[PDB]
Design a protein around this ligand. Structure first.
Ligand SMILES: [Cu+2]
Ligand SMILES: [Cu+2]
Ligand SMILES: [Cu+2]
Ligand SMILES: [Cu+2]
Length: 506
């Protein structure tokens, strides 16, 4: 296997605007097929990248900054990864793209609707396409966001190809907290990959030892990569100064959940979740990170000068974790001389509690994670046993607050994501799976459990564990329009665990 910790961690450059005034910031980002070396010992890999980079450029904005991004497709007309033609039926181009700013408080036509896709130079566009230049008003809490492809029936492929990047909203009001900043504030985009000897990406064309009933290529219900990359390098190292760093930890993997720790037994300090700063900082020895979740953390290397510390992983993917491979994420080497005094802080008091809000519960929505089997014998994962194309059923009214009760009778965790909003986690409660499957009756096998401190802030992607009912609360706004909610396991999303979400203005 590839030698661990021989390549330095890339830190994507911050994107520069094409035009900028006090009133408007204008960016251009072009999707390009490009080649990059992923490891010292590999030939360069063919990838799809925003501005031809993997990951794409980091975009940094201020809260309330009036931002526009013209996301453009300059990709080849044929994919290099295996397309399953059976999972969607519409004339249409093979390669479709659309960019979703994950966590963005964004008008619907700029949100990256799956059917708002476009081909090269916008030659062909999906039925819900409205505009070329996306508008991000950024009227939301400072937070770690990220952007990635969201094209109908292609998300697992386009994201795997390399179409992911970081987007950070800086609230000037947070500067007084003196959190680690500038070179001491570093995004970590974690992506698992399987790479062939010739350097080319491997993505399966079919399930392992496929049934003759299956089409070719065929979608698979999960992908587990043999290798872990951070910021587009296999098992990299980062030289750090002996001081406090802020890391924006982003799970940009298709399926894989990580459970992260430091191999010396040191602690993280979590300061933020998907939706921004937690009300209080939280000292953690480990944390779970499912696809699309973000942890905003401080690691304090002050007492560890000279040491090599591995960011380790205990969560398996399709089996037990391998100590020599996927148990490793990256290695910190505390060997960089201090550039200046560490004047950063790790404050306890960060933000207002979500519980300060006292919104009336307009609706309680009961939702189940289910599915069926297709003509080829493959599982089709479905929210409420409804297909993507079935008439919309999740229709919250703008400005109103709802409780969503997510029932998971399946065998695994699904990281559920709602567009537009960030939400509060209320509780999780275990139930009798067999009784639910047989009668549809919900019988609890234990008391409700409140969220861990890590989930007492704002979330937009939430782990709904097997055999539990998860309750969340969201205020639907400030915009009305057509959005989506879905599982962020991309192999599930594409077939067919995604539903429209209409925020209405009556
Ligand atoms: Cu996403
Ligand atoms: Cu999203
Ligand atoms: Cu799922
Ligand atoms: Cu989405």
């Amino acid at each position: 296997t590839l030698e661990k910790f021989v390549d330095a961690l890339p830190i994507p450059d911050t994107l520069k605007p094409v035009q900028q005034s006090k009133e408007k910031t204008y960016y251009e980002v072009t999707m390009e097929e490009c080649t990059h070396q992923l490891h010292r010992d590999l030939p360069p890999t063919r990838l799809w990248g925003y501005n031809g980079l993997f990951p794409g450029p980091t975009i940094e904005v201020k809260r309330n900054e009036n931002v526009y991004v013209k996301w453009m497709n300059n990709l080849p007309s044929t994919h290099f990864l295996p397309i399953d033609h059976t999972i969607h039926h519409s004339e249409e181009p093979e390669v479709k793209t659309v960019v979703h700013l994950h966590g963005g408080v964004t008008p619907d036509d700029s949100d990256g609707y799956p059917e708002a896709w476009f081909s090269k130079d916008f030659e062909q566009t999906g039925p819900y396409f409205k505009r070329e230049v996306y508008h991000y008003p950024n009227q939301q809490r400072g937070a770690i966001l990220w952007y990635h492809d969201h094209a109908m029936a292609l998300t697992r492929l386009n994201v795997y190809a390399g179409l992911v990047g970081a987007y950070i909203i800086h609230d000037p009001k947070e500067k007084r907290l003196k959190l680690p900043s500038d070179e001491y504030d570093v995004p970590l985009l974690i992506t698992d990959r399987t790479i062939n000897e010739d350097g080319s990406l491997f993505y399966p064309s079919a399930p392992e030892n496929p049934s003759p009933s299956l089409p070719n290529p065929s979608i698979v219900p999960a992908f587990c990569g043999e290798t872990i990359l951070v910021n587009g390098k296999v098992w990299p190292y980062l030289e750090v100064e002996p001081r406090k760093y802020r890391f924006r930890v982003i799970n940009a993997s298709n399926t894989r959940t990580y459970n992260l720790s430091l191999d010396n037994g040191g602690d993280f300090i979590q300061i933020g979740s998907d939706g921004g700063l937690l009300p209080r900082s939280v000292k953690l020895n480990s944390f779970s990170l499912a696809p699309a979740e973000r942890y905003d953390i401080i690691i304090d290397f002050t007492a560890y000068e000279g040491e090599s510390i591995i960011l380790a992983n205990s969560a398996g993917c399709g089996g037990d974790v391998n100590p020599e491979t996927d148990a490793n994420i990256m290695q910190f080497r505390v060997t960089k001389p201090l550039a200046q005094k560490d004047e950063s802080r790790k404050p306890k008091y960060l933000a207002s509690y979500p519980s300060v809000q006292h919104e009336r519960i307009q609706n309680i929505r009961t939702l189940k994670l289910a599915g069926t089997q297709d003509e080829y014998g493959r599982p089709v994962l479905l929210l409420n046993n409804k297909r993507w194309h079935d008439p919309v059923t999740e229709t919250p009214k703008v400005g109103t607050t709802e409780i969503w009760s997510i029932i998971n009778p399946t065998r695994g965790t699904h990281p559920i994501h709602l567009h537009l909003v960030s939400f509060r986690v209320l509780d999780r409660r275990p139930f009798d799976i067999a009784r639910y499957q047989e009668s549809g009756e919900l019988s609890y096998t234990g008391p409700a459990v409140p969220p861990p401190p890590s989930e007492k802030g704002w979330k937009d992607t939430i782990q709904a564990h097997a055999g539990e009912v998860l309750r969340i609360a969201a205020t639907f706004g400030p915009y009305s329009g057509r959005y989506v909610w879905h599982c962020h396991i991309l192999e599930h999303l594409d077939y067919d665990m995604m539903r429209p979400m209409d925020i209405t203005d009556p």
